[PDB]
Every structure is written in C-alpha cells, then in structure tokens.
C-alpha cells in the first residue's frame, strides 16, 4: 500500500535468491503498458528503473536474461490513474500468482484511515516460482541518466504487510459490496 | 528413443526439499549432500542432481519414454472464453424455459433484474448455493433465475 502521486513505485520483483541461478519474476508497470516476464534475471544489490529525461526507459534492475520461459503483457496494470491509496494483495499458491488491486481516495492525514475497502481481482497467471523474497522497484528520476552501478542518488512512502491464513466473516451490502469484516482469530 | 541412447531428458534425481504442486525447479546447481561447502564441482559429498535417461527401444514396455499430457482446467463458475461447440438460441423473457449459458443446466424464469455484477463476476448463488442470478455471456445484461410455478 502506498499513497504517492508521482509514479515512483511502478513495479516489483519476485524470486528465491534474486540471481541468474534460479528463476525470478519481473513485473514492471509503465505509463501505457505492463511487462511481466519470468527469466533468470541477475538482480543487483540495488535494482532501480532508469529514465533519460520522458521516454526511453532502461531496465537496469538485471544483468542478464537467457531462459525467459514465460512472458505476459496485458496493458489494460496497477497505476489506477494519477489523481490516492492503491492497495495490492499478492498471492502465490499452487503455482498461480494472484494479484488484487483497489483504488481508494484519501481524505485524511498521513495514516491508515478507518473503514473497509475490499480489493478486486486483477490477474491470475502461473509462474511456478518458489517465491521467498521480493523488492519494490521505483523510478529514481534524478533529472539525468545513471549507470548500472548500485547506490545511486537517492537524494533526488509505502506500507508492507504480511498475510497469514485467517478465517474471516464477510458482510455483503444490499448492493453486493463488502462493508464489514471480522477476523475470528 | 534412440538405439544408441537419447540423453535429452533429465529428471532431477536428488533435491534438497520436496517440491510443491505446480512448480518448476530448473536449477542446475550441485546438490550438496555433505557438510563441506560444495564449490560447484563434483565431489564425494556433492554430485550432479540432474541425471539423464537411457531411453533405448531395446527395453521392454515400462522403461520406454512415455509422453504425459496433463490438462488442468478450471470448472469454477466464472467468466470464461472456451465454451465448446455449444450453439446459441434466442433470449425469451417471462416464461418457464430451460437455460444453458456455460454448462449450467436447470429450469427457471428470467426476469432481467437490476443486480450490479462486477466484470469478474458472472454467476450469483443464494444461501443454498443455488445459482439464482447469471450474467449473459453475449449481452452485458443481468438475468435472474427464479423457479417456476
């Protein structure tokens, strides 16, 4: 979950060791399309997306990609406009990678507001990856180009929560929307 | 299969942990079975986990290569695209008729209610899990399934 409005967070990575020895999931969201590829990406110590600013983005998050057994481009995926809190639920069970999303306007201070906001299903595709680690991809936008070297110019606000198997009691409204829930545990 | 031996198939004889359903492990690392850290080379405590097959036509039935095809489909009630060679009829209204939208057979009356279904929702069930509302696959209107007299 995050409340930024400058398109900083626009992708994530998933994998076990985040190297070329094992498979890794690369999901990047652009301004007009989304790229999802499963390949042996050699993730560096500090993966980030480069920009030559407006266009011509460079994927400096990996060093090599050879196998590349699965690719997916949907271009409807996660931006939900630019005008605030976009919540996401990532699930990987039985080899299927489930993604949920929801756009909720924020009219409060810099904190998680009360109420309920159910997330809608987004995509369900099989990757068959033993995902144990992940990292958020963010565009630096340091007004100029930057090499593949890690620890770039960070000088020039997202929440992370872990899911657990829990039993819930969902209450549906008259219009079919979920307005309340109860965590039994 | 080849009479001289087809070595284009592996089966990962050894692995550190049991694999989960619907996963793929194509790692070619050396399986470290001993305590000494294996440096990527074959040794007395770490060998190659990927073993090759000895497919030869001289072997009897049971050791020959058998191609296995697993068709994993989802029959859950949801907006689908593959719906066989089943053809379509017209849409009658306010009468006791049969309905077969996506394999869901039964008998009821269509009323064209005002239920607001989401794009990922096509079927609606009641307390008894009986489908009382469906989304037409062709037309984006919502139709309720009410039992007849």
């Amino acid at each position: 979950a995050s409340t930024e409005k400058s398109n900083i967070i626009r992708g994530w990575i998933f994998g076990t060791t985040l190297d070329s020895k094992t498979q890794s999931l690369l999901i990047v969201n652009n301004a007009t399309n989304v790229v999802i590829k499963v390949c042996e990406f050699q993730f560096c110590n500090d993966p980030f997306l480069d920009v030559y600013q407006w266009m011509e983005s460079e994927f400096r998050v990996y060093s090599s990609a050879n196998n590349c057994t699965f690719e997916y481009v949907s271009q409807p995926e996660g931006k939900e406009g630019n005008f605030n809190l976009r919540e996401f639920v990532f699930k990987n069970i039985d080899g299927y990678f489930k993604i949920y999303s929801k756009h909720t306007p924020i009219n409060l201070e810099r904190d998680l507001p009360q109420g309920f906001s159910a997330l809608e299903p987004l995509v369900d595709l099989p990757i068959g990856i033993n995902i144990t680690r992940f990292q958020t991809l963010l565009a630096l936008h340091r007004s100029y180009l930057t090499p593949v070297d890690s620890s770039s110019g960070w000088t020039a606000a997202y929440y992370v929560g872990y899911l657990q198997p829990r039993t819930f009691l969902l209450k549906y409204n008259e219009n079919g929307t979920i307005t309340d829930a109860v965590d039994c545990a | 299969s080849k009479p001289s031996g087809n070595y284009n198939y592996l089966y990962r004889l050894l692995r550190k942990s049991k694999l989960k359903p619907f996963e793929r492990d194509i790692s070619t690392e050396i399986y470290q079975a001993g305590n000494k850290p294996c440096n990527g080379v074959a040794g007395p405590n770490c060998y190659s986990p990927l073993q090759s097959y000895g497919f030869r036509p001289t072997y009897g039935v049971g050791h020959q290569p058998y191609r296995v095809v697993v068709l994993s489909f989802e029959l859950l009630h949801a907006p689908a695209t593959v719906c066989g060679p089943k053809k379509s009829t017209n849409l009658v209204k306010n009468k006791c008729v049969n309905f077969n939208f996506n394999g869901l057979t039964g008998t009821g009356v269509l009323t064209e209610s005002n239920k607001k279904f989401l794009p990922f929702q096509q079927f609606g069930r009641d307390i008894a899990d009986t489908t009382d509302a469906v989304r037409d696959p062709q037309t984006l209107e919502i139709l309720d399934i009410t039992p007849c007299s």
Binding site: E87, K102, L112, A118, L119, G161 | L76, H77, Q121
Partner: peptide, 18 residues
C-alpha cells in the same frame, strides 16, 4: 527509514467471483 504502524480494518479482498 522504517516505521511501524497498524492496519485497523484493511486488507480484505473478494475470495471468489460469486
């Protein structure tokens, strides 16, 4: 860099498509 907060009543999603 890192802070700790609590989610009061958020994190719910539609389990099925019914």
């Amino acid at each position: 860099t890192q802070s700790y907060t609590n989610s009061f009543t958020r994190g719910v999603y539609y389990p099925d498509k019914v």
